[PDB]
Amino acid sequence: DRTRYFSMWNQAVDSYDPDVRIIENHGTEDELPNYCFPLGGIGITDTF
Amino acid sequence: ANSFLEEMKKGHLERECMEETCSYEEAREVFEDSDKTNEFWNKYKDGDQCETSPCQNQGKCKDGLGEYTCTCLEGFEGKNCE
Ligand SMILES: [Ca+2]
Ligand SMILES: [Ca+2]
Ligand SMILES: [Ca+2]
């Protein structure tokens, strides 16, 4: 095998990521949106 | 007066039109009313002008950006009902 490494002879074979050679496309899953909020929480306000 | 949030929050006269220039609208936003829009915004820098009631003989006052209108009754007129 050549899929493992060894320091003794600087032994490691170069490779590449699979998905980089051929990409895929499925979009993603994003039904739920994502929200930021004010550090306090209510920000605006109005004397009462 | 103006900012990313100075004109994005609630419109309150106790906020925008008071401590800078109060150029325009921020005296109209608070009330949503273009009637005293330019009959009151002239009184932001130099003080009021009709508070003295220059018109005598029971004559009403009207403020303009530089000159004052004095409405005196039938048979009465004048620059200050004078
Ligand atoms: Ca302010
Ligand atoms: Ca306003
Ligand atoms: Ca305003």
Curated annotation (Swiss-Prot), chain B:
In the UniProt annotation, what is the result of changing E7G?
A: In FA10D; St. Louis II; strongly reduced activity; not activated by factor VIIa and tissue factor
Q: What is the effect of changing E32Q?
A: In FA10D; Tokyo
What are the EGF-like domain coordinates in residue numbering?
46-82
- The intrachain disulfides are C17-C22, C50-C61, C55-C70, C72-C81
Modified sites of kind (3R)-3-hydroxyaspartate: D63
The residues forming a coiled coil are: none
User: Which segments constitute the Gla domain?
Assistant: 1-45
Where are the 4-carboxyglutamate residues found in this chain? E6, E7, E14, E16, E19, E20, E25, E26, E29, E32, E39
Tree of life domain: Eukaryota
**Protein's UniProt name:** Factor X light chain
Q: Which organism is it from?
A: Homo sapiens
Q: Which gene encodes it?
A: F10
